[PDB]
Amino acid sequence: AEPRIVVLGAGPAGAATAIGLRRLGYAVTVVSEWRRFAAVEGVSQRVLEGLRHVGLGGALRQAAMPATRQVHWNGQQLHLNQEFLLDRQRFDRALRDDLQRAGVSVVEGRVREVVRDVGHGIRLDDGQVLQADFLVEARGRQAPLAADRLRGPETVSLLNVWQAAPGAPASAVESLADGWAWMARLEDGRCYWQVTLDAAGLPGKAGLADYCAARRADSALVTELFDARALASAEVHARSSTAILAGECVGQDWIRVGDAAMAVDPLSGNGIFQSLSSALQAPVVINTLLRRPERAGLARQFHQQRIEQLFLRFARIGRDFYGQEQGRVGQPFWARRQGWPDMQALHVAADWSAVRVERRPVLRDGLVDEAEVVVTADQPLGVWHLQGVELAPAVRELQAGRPLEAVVSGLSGEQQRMVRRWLLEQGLV
Ligand SMILES: Cc1cc2nc3c(=O)[nH]c(=O)nc-3n(C[C@H](O)[C@H](O)[C@H](O)COP(=O)(O)OP(=O)(O)OC[C@H]3O[C@@H](n4cnc5c(N)ncnc54)[C@H](O)[C@@H]3O)c2cc1C
């Protein structure tokens, strides 16, 4: 009498969630399409061990290759390295091995339609119908269009892909007047160029090839890095790269993870990590939805609020990157992106007067429960405990006028010093 869990999509987020469910003891089936266009992304040192932290590190090193990287930004020609390139062709095909290794069924196929048929009726292009008691939606930006909770400045990434001479790997980033470009050349000679711009005023389909060709032809970086440019014959692709927080991300028997839940624009070079963050606690939410469905409200709130806070944090991190470009002051592309989503600092200022004790969702023993937590400026979702020491009783007593020394007198001296340091950081000084 075990639930049928089906995950749609086998990118980083779907794969991560599937393996997490396996570790909780769940049988899991993943459905996803074999491949898509040739895309290579920039990945940091963190992402790759973060990707093995989740258990996808096998899918990793034959898809990732080291490469130098010229960075042009704020008037500085800067030659960084120790960041890699990830070939999503190798990567996604390799993700399926790690899933089968973990005991996950990988049913290849494009999903046609999902229907409310007792459970979930997942109808595939080849006519097969897979029944799901629980559905994980993990098809990335290709997820079915729902309403948005938040939407940033409309943004498009235009991509050129072509073939050049092998054996000369490199990558680069340059700030342009009305956008920025990322480009890469793999060791086998595959070439990549992707420019990120405001969606407004771009040409239609027929004009995109000429538009990209002129931009590549205008770049001294493109000339240096690429001997053959294939200005006329390069494939041309257009990707929506708008920052999007999904309107709905969890139900009684479904959950969205990854880009299907939230995605910010790709300036950070950290999207895969950010998508993994959105799936990190998806398995415990599912575990609650299945083992204690009476607590679905709490579990749903836990996932929604985590996803929204992640989205906002990554959006502000990206904003600060845009803000490092200080030589573009009259340009609408940059001004719009240097002030979005807002001007709030990444670490908010304390306000002890505003601290509240509230009953909020918490994680305990693999299930979303509810507990009195302490809500602060820096933690809108609340802090439950520090190393087992629940804070709400202390803060209740402090707000009732009990002196701090008495409030903490029952803990060990080390726990007393731990609690005092937290209170200082929350503005009780
Ligand atoms: C222009 C651009 C540039 C980026 N650059 C970077 C970068 O340099 N570094 C970085 O770390 N991140 C980058 N990202 C972000 C990164 O691609 C995503 O964060 C990440 O891939 C999202 O993971 P996911 O598993 O949620 O979705 P995906 O990785 O997109 O996985 C979705 C999976 O589902 C499949 N699928 C889609 N539709 C269907 C369907 N109907 N039926 C079945 N399967 C389906 C797809 O084939 C795919 O395997 C970039 C994103 C964009 C848009």
Residue numbers in the entry: 2 to 430
Pull text from the paper.
Cysteine tryptophylquinone (CTQ) is a protein-derived quinone cofactor initially identified in quinohemoprotein amine dehydrogenase (QHNDH), a bacterial enzyme that catalyzes oxidative deamination of various aliphatic primary amines for use as energy, carbon, and nitrogen sources. Here, we shed light on the qhpG gene, which has been predicted to encode a flavoprotein monooxygenase, directly involved in CTQ biogenesis. Biochemical evidence reported herein proves that QhpG is an atypical single-component monooxygenase, catalyzing dihydroxylation of an unmodified Trp residue in the protein substrate. Based on these results, we concluded that the CTQ-precursor Trp43 is doubly hydroxylated, most likely at 6- and 7-positions of the indole ring, by the QhpG reaction.
In the crystal, each asymmetric unit contained two monomers that are related by a non-crystallographic (NCS) two-fold axis and packed compactly. Thus, the dimerization is assumed to be a crystallographic artifact. Each monomer consists of a large N-terminal catalytic domain (residues 1–344) and a small C-terminal winged-helix (WH) domain (residues 349–429), with a large pocket between the two domains. The catalytic domain of QhpG contains a glutathione reductase-type Rossmann-fold for FAD binding, in which FAD is bound between two lobes of the catalytic domain, showing a clear Fo–Fc omit map for the entire FAD molecule. Briefly, the isoalloxazine ring of FAD is sandwiched by the side chains of Pro267 and Glu42/Arg240 from the re- and si-faces, respectively. The di-phosphate moiety interacts with the side chains of Arg36 and Arg89, and the main chain NH groups of Ala14 and Asp260. Two channels connecting the molecular surfaces to the re- and si-faces of the isoalloxazine ring of FAD have been identified. The narrow and deep re-face channel is open at the bottom of the large pocket between the two domains and composed of the main chains of Gly43–Val44 and Ser269–Asn271, and several hydrophobic residues (Val72, Trp74, Val174, Trp181, Trp183, Leu268, and Phe322), most of which are conserved in SvCmlS and QhpG orthologs. The side chains of Glu42 and Arg240 are apart by ~4.5 Å from each other, suggesting a weak electrostatic interaction, and are located over the middle of the isoalloxazine ring. It is possible that Glu42 and Arg240 act as a lid for the si-face channel, through which dissolved dioxygen is able to access to the isoalloxazine ring.
